[PDB]
């Protein structure tokens, strides 16, 4: 299962098994026993507007 | 949210996606490229069928 | 950064001197290159027979 | 691009530049500009840049 998403640059500590901020409870929180992976990085020059 | 292209760092906008596997619970059909060879015979060997 | 050429041409018939005269020198080309020029040399067309 | 301590120069003169798909991009990071306020500069003309 592939799951994607964007999120701001400070928000990304909170995406970690064993946490619980405000994106990680009430937006997507992903179970402790996680037998996965995490993907990240920056898309300024793509999603950003004057 | 707010994203302007003047914004500091922490406030640009990243992009993530996570990946989910299973731990044998249905014949596996996904894994990387395996090169298969011939099929030797009346020998001790180990074996990946 | 500029080298600037001011060019005349004039029929004489003195025979050693410079001519006791007078005669303006318009403009021949500009260059928009910036160098530091110090020396500078002379080309002649010898026969080659 | 060339490091900082060998800084690349080019001399860009003889031409029709339009900065308004300079400024408005929102590639950049930063920007800031000094001689003239930016929405004033395609209204005038130099040379040698
Ligand atoms: C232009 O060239 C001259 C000579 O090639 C340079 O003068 C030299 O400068 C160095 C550094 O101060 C001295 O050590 C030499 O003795 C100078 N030589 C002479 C003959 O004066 C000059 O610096 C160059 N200018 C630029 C802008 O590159």
């Known amino acids: 299962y592939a799951d994607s998403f964007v999120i701001r640059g400070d928000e990304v500590r909170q995406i970690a098994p064993g946490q ?14 996680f037998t996965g992976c995490v993907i990240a990085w920056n898309s300024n020059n793509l999603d950003s507007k004057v | 949210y707010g994203f302007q292209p003047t914004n500091g760092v922490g406030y640009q906008p990243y992009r993530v996606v996570v990946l989910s ?19 030797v015979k009346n020998k001790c060997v180990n074996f990946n069928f | 950064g500029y080298f600037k050429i001011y060019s005349k041409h004039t029929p004489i018939n003195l025979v050693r001197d410079l001519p006791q005269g ?8 500009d260059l928009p290159i910036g160098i530091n020029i110090t020396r500078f040399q002379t080309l002649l067309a010898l026969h080659r027979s | 691009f060339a490091s900082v301590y060998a800084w690349n120069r080019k001399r860009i003169s003889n031409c029709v530049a339009d900065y308004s ?22 209204d005038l003309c130099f040379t040698n840049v």
């Not at chain 1, 619980?20 to 026993?33: E, H, R, S």
């Not at chain 4, 300079?22 to 395609?42: D, E, H, I, R």
């Open chain 1, 20 to 33: 619980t901020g405000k994106i990680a409870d009430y937006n997507y929180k992903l179970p402790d026993d």
């Open chain 2, 21 to 39: 596997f299973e731990l044998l619970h249905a014949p596996a059909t996904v894994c990387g490229p395996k090169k298969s060879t011939n099929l």
């Open chain 3, 22 to 29: 007078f005669s303006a020198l318009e403009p021949l080309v």
């Open chain 4, 21 to 42: 798909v300079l400024y408005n991009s929102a590639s950049f990071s930063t920007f800031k500009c000094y001689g003239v306020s930016p929405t004033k500069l395609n």
